[PDB]
Design a protein around this ligand. Sequence first.
Ligand SMILES: [Mg+2]
Ligand SMILES: [Mg+2]
Lengths: 279, 275
Amino acid sequence: MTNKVLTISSYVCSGFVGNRCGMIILDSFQIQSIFVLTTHLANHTGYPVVGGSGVLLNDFISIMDSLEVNHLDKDIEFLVTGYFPSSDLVYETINRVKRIKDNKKVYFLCDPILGDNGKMYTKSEVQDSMKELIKYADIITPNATELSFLTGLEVNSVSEAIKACHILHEQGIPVILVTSIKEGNDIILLCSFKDTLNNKNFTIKIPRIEGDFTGVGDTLTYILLSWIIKGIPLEHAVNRAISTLQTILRNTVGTAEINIINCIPYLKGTEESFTITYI
Amino acid sequence: MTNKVLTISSYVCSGFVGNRCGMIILDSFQIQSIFVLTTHLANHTGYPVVGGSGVLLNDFISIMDSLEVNHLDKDIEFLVTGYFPSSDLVYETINRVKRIKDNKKVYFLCDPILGDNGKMYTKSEVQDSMKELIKYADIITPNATELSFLTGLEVNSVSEAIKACHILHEQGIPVILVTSIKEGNDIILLCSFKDTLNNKNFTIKIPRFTGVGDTLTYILLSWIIKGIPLEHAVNRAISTLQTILRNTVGTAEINIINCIPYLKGTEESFTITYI
Ligand SMILES: [Mg+2]
Ligand SMILES: [Mg+2]
């Protein structure tokens, strides 16, 4: 028993976003992980009403200090960040990422959670701070809206997404997975590399299951991470993750929540249902 | 797609106690549940340093109100409480439990977490408030220390445990599962009923860590939810728990993630003895 993953993201008491998605997925894959919360909310922000508060910086610091002093994060090989309610937590997380990476190799997946479908669901201060946090990541997983924000470019096509990714690669980010780009009633995912000598950029086209969930992206992030941790090459890890996500969505009745509890037995599916098209 | 369980208890970022045990176990049984936290701590209280804070009453209220107004608790059939850092949250929970039960049938398992091995690990104000909370429960799961604290009786034997249970049954509590009693060099679990006309008290002799009890609570609850009679549910839960403990290296944390495939174990290893 040693902790392999540290993941810093939101929590909801009911339903499935952020670190609650993280918990279900990483538990099911039996990947021992630390789940540091950035919120304690009743439910996600889609509902008629929300209750609860974001985690305060002093408490976050107290937690991260406790993990370090008790050696509970000594053996972490992977780091994830997701939703932050305030920029002070983002900047503190940067400080912690720097320290974590200072004496060991840690693969940091930053899911730059800011909004979806053209619209932000984060504070404007958080957006700016996120432009700094992503610079420290090994891989980032923006949706098109998040990419557009992070770069100031429009992202309404694969061609546009490639141009925007390039801005971020120039800042040093090695790998960018753009998780949803709208094309007709298909969604396109793009995996873009800074080093296109030794890696090939690719896309995956999938049909749209007419939907809603922010838990969609969050679920994708953790399934993808799990397979990366299990040693599956990235192309294949992405194909598994999106494939499993599509199975989840077909098995989802409402649009309030992704049906992730009931699909736990299917989370480790190895089906790679889609075609990887290189650029 | 509806929440069946509401569980209100502690949270740790690393390791397994309280609602974190609750999540792993209820998730693995695919029982859709609401997990309201009462703390957000780095790690359990076994370590020299315990970063993070207890949940504040205002936030707790805001959470509970949101669940209610969004109808996310409308279809709850089971309620669990565990650890509370402060009595204000206990008294608010009592308000919530009264409302939930006044207009629907909800089975409330109260794990009256106060302490273990003679010693409290809760604030004194929490003890007093817990004596009130338990009065609303359908079943309570004290250990012998907790039972002794809740009644003022010594609990060093089954016969003593029965006398203590009787105090609490007279307050209305229907079922009391006393989870460990040190009788000589035996460890005995007792299930005592207020209604001994329609139910038979029993004991289970069992062989001799931080989230052990919490794991029992949730496996037990899961089998009750799956429709297993209480005697069998208890035997399964203690059988599975011990499997987890026996396959745990060292004592800092229970090996619950590696044991996920065994959480739905149906072995009933021990002997039920009616008393
Ligand atoms: Mg997202
Ligand atoms: Mg206990």
